[PDB]
């Protein structure tokens, strides 16, 4: 019998945000954003009803060292708390081993965020100096990228980050943005290009993306391994993309409402 599909996502603008009069609303009505629109498109196409719920620990998802327990949205799927994850969750090897991913609905890569004027234009620049600190988001693909990389420049950046004091790692993207904006150029943030270019179009328009991306990957709609939803969700993403819906949604939340020109 038909049952409401539990969707796990995360409060990360502009993917999922609280609507202005959210205190008055209930259920899915409380939220708005790219993934809120995407979730509606996928549901309509796959013919199911859903319930959006913000991940409890507010994390994307990593396997805890020692306990070996997955947290974040990935954990929700692994331990059976949610039927599907619709958010800017990166497709990775270690995640693909425990959960399923549809083909990408958005392409991206790790990038460098700086406060305008900062004397840095590449990862190599960051790795060769010590005056400007830099870090990443915790519990996700970005931190794991530097921890696993065998590439010289990235390995050197990891070696420095992992033992920096005070910590250069943040719990949420907003925490990293605020750290860049209030550090007078003494902090650079490593985050995915999607998020970097989004913040580049927001007041006070004081941040900027420098250099090219360090890698190339994508976000995928995830489901518990072997879930019956997988096939239809994948086809839905491919169709939505071919119809131009996805390009339309990104303009809607990124550029249409741009605040810096
Ligand atoms: C969004 C976002 O932007 N930079 C990042 O590290 C992230 C999280 C990343 N998508 C993950 O799955 O861990």
Swiss-Prot record:
Stretches of the chain found on the membrane's Extracellular side: 119-261
Domain of life: Eukaryota
Domain remarks in the Swiss-Prot or TrEMBL record: The M4 transmembrane segment mediates tetramerization and is required for cell surface expression.
Location within or outside the cell: Cell membrane; Postsynaptic cell membrane; Postsynaptic density membrane
Protein name, entry field: Glutamate receptor 2
Site (Crucial to convey clamshell closure to channel opening): 120
Function as written in the Swiss-Prot or TrEMBL entry: Ionotropic glutamate receptor that functions as a ligand-gated cation channel, gated by L-glutamate and glutamatergic agonists such as alpha-amino-3-hydroxy-5-methyl-4-isoxazolepropionic acid (AMPA), quisqualic acid, and kainic acid. L-glutamate acts as an excitatory neurotransmitter at many synapses in the central nervous system and plays an important role in fast excitatory synaptic transmission.
Tissue expression profile of the protein: Detected in forebrain. Detected in dendrites of neuronal cells. Expressed in the pyramidal cell layers of CA1 and CA3 and in the granule cell layer of the dentate gyrus.
Family membership noted in the UniProt record: Belongs to the glutamate-gated ion channel (TC 1.A.10.1) family. GRIA2 subfamily.
One cellular component (GO) term of this entry: presynaptic membrane
Residues annotated for L-glutamate binding in this entry: 88, 90, 95, 141-142, 192
Native source species: Rattus norvegicus (Rat)
């Amino acid at each position: 019998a038909n049952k409401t599909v539990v969707v796990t996502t995360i409060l990360e603008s502009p993917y999922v945000m609280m609507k202005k009069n959210h205190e008055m609303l209930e259920g899915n009505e409380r939220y708005e954003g790219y993934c809120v629109d995407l979730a509606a498109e996928i549901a309509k196409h796959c013919g199911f009803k859903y319930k959006l719920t913000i991940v409890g620990d507010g994390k994307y998802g990593a396997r805890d060292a020692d306990t070996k327990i997955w947290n974040g949205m990935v954990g929700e799927l692994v331990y059976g708390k949610a039927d599907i994850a619709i958010a800017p969750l990166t497709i990775t090897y270690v995640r693909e081993e425990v959960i399923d991913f549809s083909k990408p609905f958005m392409s991206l890569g790790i990038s460098i965020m700086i406060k305008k004027g900062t004397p840095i234009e590449s990862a190599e620049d960051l790795s060769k100096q010590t005056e400007i600190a830099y870090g990443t988001l915790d519990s996700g693909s970005t931190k794991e990228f530097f921890r696993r990389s065998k590439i010289a420049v990235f390995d050197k950046m990891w070696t420095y980050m992992r033992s920096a004091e005070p910590s250069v790692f943040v719990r949420t993207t907003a925490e990293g943005v605020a750290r860049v904006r209030k550090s007078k150029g003494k902090y650079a943030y490593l985050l995915e290009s999607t998020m970097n270019e989004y913040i580049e179009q927001r007041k006070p328009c004081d941040t900027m993306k420098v250099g090219g991306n360090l890698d190339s990957k994508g976000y995928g709609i995830a489901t518990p391994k072997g879930s019956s939803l997988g096939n239809a969700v994948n086809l839905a993403v491919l169709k939505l993309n071919e119809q131009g819906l996805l390009d339309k949604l990104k303009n809607k939340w990124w550029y249409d409402k741009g605040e810096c020109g």
